[PDB]
Amino acid sequence: RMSMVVSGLTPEEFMLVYKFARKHHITLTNLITEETTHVVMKTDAEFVCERTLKYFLGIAGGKWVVSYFWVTQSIKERKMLNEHDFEVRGDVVNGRNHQGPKRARESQDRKIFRGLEICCYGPFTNMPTDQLEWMVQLCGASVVKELSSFTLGTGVHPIVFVQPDAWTFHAIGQMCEAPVVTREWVLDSVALYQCQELDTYLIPQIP
Ligand SMILES: [Co+2]
Predict the structure, then answer these.
(1) Is residue 65 a contact partner of residue 91, using CB atoms and an 8 Å limit?
(2) Is 110 exposed, middle or buried (0-12, 13-18, 19+ CB in 10 A)?
(3) What separation in Å is there between the alpha carbon of 112 and the centre of ligand 1?
């Protein structure tokens, strides 16, 4: 059936979702899994939310990323409103209207990271490696654990991403032949659901 997960909400805001969840036989839960169908985000009146991890994984699964206004209007009108009307416009960081989740629902037959080998490299911070790995998988990429493990083949394009405010490196180029980008290449590529160009994102590689 329907299974719901919640993001950016207060206790009382949560209680409202639960009431809506109880009234409509919807499972509510703490952590997002593949079983999750809906991700309720807090937004401003014009469906703009902050980009949480559940935001990305939600879009990565191409679920229903939908504003908390879905919940309260549904309570107000005493009926389960259309998810279509309430979906999240975009976010505070990628722009007030990129309609990201929209494309993601519409494009499961061709996922943006199809045909790619991705290596989430070294230390990571707000987001753990495995979440980013699962994100990246969900969008049709193939995870590599170590640089040396890239399918050296005309077939696939390998990418290495890193987030550099963690290593408390620019010599990945010396250990493998791959584009090195910044974790924001993935996050934006997922937020916008377009496959971003690596130029704006490349980390310098010393010879
Ligand atoms: Co090519």
Answers:
(1) no
(2) exposed
(3) 14
**Rounded Cα gap, residues 56 and 137, in angstroms:** 12
Cα of 138 from ligand 1 centre, angstroms: 21
**Distance from the CA of 157 to the center of ligand 1, in angstroms?**
6
Q: How far is the centre of ligand 1, averaged over its atoms, from the C-alpha of 202 (Å)?
A: 17
CA distance 117 to 81: 40
CA-to-CA distance for 67 and 94, rounded, in angstroms? 17
Rounded CA separation 101/7 (Å): 15
Q: What technique solved it?
A: X-ray
85 Cα to the center of ligand 1, angstroms: 38
- Between the CA of 115 and the centroid of ligand 1 the distance, in Å, is 10
* Ligand 1 center to 154 CA (angstroms): 8
Fold of 108-207: Rossmann fold (3.40.50)
Resolution in A for the shown PDB structure? 2.8
In whole angstroms, what is the distance from residue 78 CA to residue 101 CA?
26
List the CATH code of the domain at 1-107: 3.40.50.10190
